[PDB]
Amino acid sequence: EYELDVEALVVILRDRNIPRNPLHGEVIGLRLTEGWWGQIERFQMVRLILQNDDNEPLQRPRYEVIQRAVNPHTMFMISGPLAELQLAFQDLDLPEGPLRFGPLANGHYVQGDPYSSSYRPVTMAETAQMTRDELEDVLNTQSEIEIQMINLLELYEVETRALRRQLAERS
Amino acid sequence: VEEYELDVEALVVILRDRNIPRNPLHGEVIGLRLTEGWWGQIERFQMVRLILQNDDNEPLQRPRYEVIQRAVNPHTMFMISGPLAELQLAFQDLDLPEGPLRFGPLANGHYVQGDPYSSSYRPVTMAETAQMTRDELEDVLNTQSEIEIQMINLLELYEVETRALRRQLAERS
């Protein structure tokens, strides 16, 4: 649990033409368009803590990291650079292992899908920061991704060959 | 500096099976393409050096071989491809090299469109990652990430080319 600046959060909401007031217990899916890891999208999931067990507003509100990957259907979503989002979510960082991939957290790479299109592997800055088990999980997941990319590359070659043949036959 | 047993007669059968008539010499280094093994039916690479004699140029009753910590290259001169089980007949306890060395020509992430080694490349399997040290994992992941960056770039290029070709077709109805 880290510190939450709710007035910064509201500015972030308004800048994005989101009118809803953030509520206690709400979960938010974050798309971080860039950060310390580089200029590539990553994902994080947080839960607002605005009140205490007695249902009274906190003087110093907080948020917590949720250990589930952000999904394409994730309802409440915010995109922005790490530096901007940290205005609301103090110390915000990437989640463990392949969770940071969001919709690709389980290696499902889909042709034509915007998220698959935007996916980018972990950088060297990221891997220096990982534990052994994180590295295994990330590596396992990127490997699954590569297997689909490879399969897609083969299909592209066959199709490209066929198209070129069709084009000669019709020229 | 670990050395392992070598069955030269078995090596020579391996060679004859492949129409290679040369006899193995002390100090020769061999590039191995393991077509399949305990990691699965995908190709991996390993490099070894024959030890047939002692420091006094006398033939060993028990020849050995050692692993060379360098990646097999496409130009590697003396090459042998076979499944691990077969190659283990000659090289006792043959196993994959450390981290991305096992990719041979791709050990440094150089993924090239149309290149046969690039086309045959396959990422590490879960059987492989479970065995690896942290630093191995890091190196391998860093390498595979460079590969995917090249694959991503290539996918884009296919999609553009595909588009183009389909238009030219369409306009020929």
Author numbering:
A (entry chain A): 9 to 179
B (entry chain B): 7 to 179
Sentences from the paper on this structure:
PFV Gag is a 648 polypeptide and the major FV structural protein in the assembled virion. Moreover, in all retroviral subfamilies Gag carries out the same functional roles including assembly, nucleic acid packaging, transport to and budding through the cytoplasmic membrane of the producer cell as well as trafficking through the cytoplasm of the target cell and uncoating. Here we report the crystal structure an amino terminal domain from the Gag of PFV (PFV-Gag-NtD), provide the molecular details of the interaction of this domain with the N-terminal leader sequence from the PFV Envelope (PFV-Env) and demonstrate that the PFV-Gag-NtD is also the target for Trim5α restriction factors. Our data reveal that the FV Gag is unique and structurally unrelated to the Gag protein of other retroviruses.
Bioinformatic analysis of the primary sequence and that of related FVs suggested that the N-terminal 179 residues of PFV-Gag comprised a stable domain (PFV-Gag-NtD). This fragment was expressed in E. coli and subsequently the crystal structure determined by SAD methods and refined at a resolution of 2.4 Å. The final Rwork/Rfree are 17.2% and 23.0% respectively. By comparison, our data reveals the PFV-Gag-NtD to be entirely unrelated comprising a mixed α/β protein with head and stalk domains. The PFV-Gag-NtD dimer interface buries approximately 1700 Å2 of the monomer surface area. The large central coiled-coil formed by helix α6 comprises the majority of this interface, supplemented by residues in helices α4 and α5 and the adjoining loop. The coiled-coil contains three regions of leucine zipper at residues Leu143/147, Leu160/161 and Leu171/175. Additionally, a highly synergistic hydrogen-bonding network centred on residue Glu154 is located between two of the zipper regions. Here, the Glu154 sidechain forms hydrogen bonds with the sidechains of Glu154*, Gln150* and Tyr127* of the opposing monomer. In FVs the proposed CTRS constitutes residues 43 to 60 of the PFV-Gag-NtD where residues Leu40 to Arg50 form the loop that links β1 to β2 and the remainder make up the β2 strand.
